[PDB]
Every structure is written in C-alpha cells, then in structure tokens.
Design a protein around this motif. Sequence first.
Motif, PDB file in Angstrom:
ATOM      1  N   UNK A  57       0.872  -1.169   0.000  1.00  0.00           N
ATOM      2  CA  UNK A  57       0.000   0.000   0.000  1.00  0.00           C
ATOM      3  C   UNK A  57       0.912   1.223   0.000  1.00  0.00           C
ATOM      4  N   UNK A  58       2.044   1.063   0.672  1.00  0.00           N
ATOM      5  CA  UNK A  58       3.069   2.086   0.800  1.00  0.00           C
ATOM      6  C   UNK A  58       3.628   2.459  -0.564  1.00  0.00           C
ATOM      7  N   UNK A  91      -7.893  -0.228   4.895  1.00  0.00           N
ATOM      8  CA  UNK A  91      -9.094   0.043   4.125  1.00  0.00           C
ATOM      9  C   UNK A  91      -8.789   0.402   2.681  1.00  0.00           C
ATOM     10  N   UNK A  92      -9.817   0.315   1.845  1.00  0.00           N
ATOM     11  CA  UNK A  92      -9.691   0.659   0.440  1.00  0.00           C
ATOM     12  C   UNK A  92      -9.733   2.181   0.441  1.00  0.00           C
ATOM     13  N   UNK A  93      -8.670   2.831  -0.062  1.00  0.00           N
ATOM     14  CA  UNK A  93      -8.638   4.296  -0.093  1.00  0.00           C
ATOM     15  C   UNK A  93      -9.848   4.931  -0.767  1.00  0.00           C
ATOM     16  N   UNK A  94     -10.442   4.220  -1.723  1.00  0.00           N
ATOM     17  CA  UNK A  94     -11.612   4.731  -2.434  1.00  0.00           C
ATOM     18  C   UNK A  94     -12.910   4.452  -1.671  1.00  0.00           C
TER      19      UNK A  94
ATOM     20  N   UNK B  98     -19.673  -1.416  22.132  1.00  0.00           N
ATOM     21  CA  UNK B  98     -19.815  -2.336  21.010  1.00  0.00           C
ATOM     22  C   UNK B  98     -19.684  -1.546  19.723  1.00  0.00           C
ATOM     23  N   UNK B  99     -18.546  -1.728  19.069  1.00  0.00           N
ATOM     24  CA  UNK B  99     -18.212  -0.992  17.855  1.00  0.00           C
ATOM     25  C   UNK B  99     -18.356  -1.778  16.548  1.00  0.00           C
ATOM     26  N   UNK B 100     -18.504  -1.022  15.460  1.00  0.00           N
ATOM     27  CA  UNK B 100     -18.592  -1.551  14.095  1.00  0.00           C
ATOM     28  C   UNK B 100     -18.594  -0.402  13.093  1.00  0.00           C
ATOM     29  N   UNK B 101     -18.391  -0.742  11.828  1.00  0.00           N
ATOM     30  CA  UNK B 101     -18.333   0.247  10.775  1.00  0.00           C
ATOM     31  C   UNK B 101     -19.032  -0.219   9.499  1.00  0.00           C
ATOM     32  N   UNK B 102     -19.144   0.721   8.559  1.00  0.00           N
ATOM     33  CA  UNK B 102     -19.729   0.510   7.240  1.00  0.00           C
ATOM     34  C   UNK B 102     -18.576   0.726   6.276  1.00  0.00           C
ATOM     35  N   UNK B 103     -18.872   0.726   4.988  1.00  0.00           N
ATOM     36  CA  UNK B 103     -17.815   0.804   4.010  1.00  0.00           C
ATOM     37  C   UNK B 103     -18.259   1.491   2.732  1.00  0.00           C
ATOM     38  N   UNK B 104     -18.774   2.708   2.844  1.00  0.00           N
ATOM     39  CA  UNK B 104     -19.233   3.430   1.666  1.00  0.00           C
ATOM     40  C   UNK B 104     -18.165   3.545   0.581  1.00  0.00           C
TER      41      UNK B 104
END
Lengths: 98, 104
Positions: A57-58, A91-94, B98-104
């Motif tokens: 990624x770097x 994460x995906x940068x986009x 209690x944590x979590x995320x999305x991924x727009x």
Amino acid sequence: MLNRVFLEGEIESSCWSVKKTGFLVTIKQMRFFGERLFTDYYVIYANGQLAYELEKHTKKYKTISIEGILRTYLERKSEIWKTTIEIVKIFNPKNEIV
Amino acid sequence: MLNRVFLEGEIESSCWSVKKTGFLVTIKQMRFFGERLFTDYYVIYANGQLAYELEKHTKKYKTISIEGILRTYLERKSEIWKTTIEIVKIFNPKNEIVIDYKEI
C-alpha cells in the motif's frame, strides 16, 4: 478490554523492523485548530503476512486508512515506552468508513 | 480526518493544567507478552464541561471507558511524538460498548 482505533493519514515514511519481523509506517495528520496549524505524527504497524500488504500500500498510495488497536512497548537500548497502533485491517482508499 | 478511538482502563493518576484549561488522566490497560501479564499506560484528557465530568468520574470510579480522538505532541528531546487521547465521550461504567463500521 475495549481498544479500537480508526485512523487515516498521509504516509511520511516506513521501514521494516530489525528482524524485518514487522513493517512500521509513519502517517501524518495535519490541521488548523484555532489560529494555528497542528500536525500529528503516528506510527502504525503490521506483522506477519499483513506487513507485506502494508508495504505494498506504501508503494501504491500516498495516504492510508486502517483499523487496529492502541499499544505501547519498551524500546530496549532506547529506554523509552513508545505508543503505536497495531493494524487489524487496511481500508480501500476509495472507500469511506463510518 | 478518520480519527476515532474507543478505549478502557484503570485510572492511575490525573491532574489539572495551569489555568485548568483541561484535565489529564492516565489510564492502565492490561497487556500480555507470551505468558507474562503486563501493562499499557495511556494519557487521556478533556476540556470544558467534560473536564469536570472526568474529574468527577475520577473521584467515583476506578475504571473508565471512552470514545476519543488520537492526538500527539512533540517530545523535543528524544524527538518522539508522544500520544494522547482527546476525550469526546465518557461511557457509563455499567454499559457494554460495542463498535462496528460501514464501508461506503
């Protein structure tokens, strides 16, 4: 217990451990707060196979966004307790998060 | 910039800055190293109303869980950028987070 960090920053530099066991990357967050700009520097890292995904990624992107846990460790011939983030997921940068 | 932290530990010590602009607390979180049980120390802080909530939660509970923003400042000597957590939210020591995320 509870320990989750979601951090995104600009890649400043990165290198491997001594044993090349892990890949450490320094990321920077720079912003205006009052009348003045504050810049923050963070050292995140990954071990095992993930240290190679991190290193790639770097080579690909100028910025990185990860997920991980806050950790500290003692630098031996260095005397100091340093704080860092051990990566869990890049994460995906986009892609955004939330 | 994506910057959110959730953490919990045992209050170890704390103090007010000079003009009491903020209140600083130092937390301990248990860590392992092989079979050895050790410790991690973090420094957290708060401003305004929440600084006073912190000091109170401090004179009432031993542990504390929060939501915050990871910051740093320069240690001009060792040239190491030290880490601190700017507290955004304090949780009820009786609540399971209690944590979590999305991924727009």
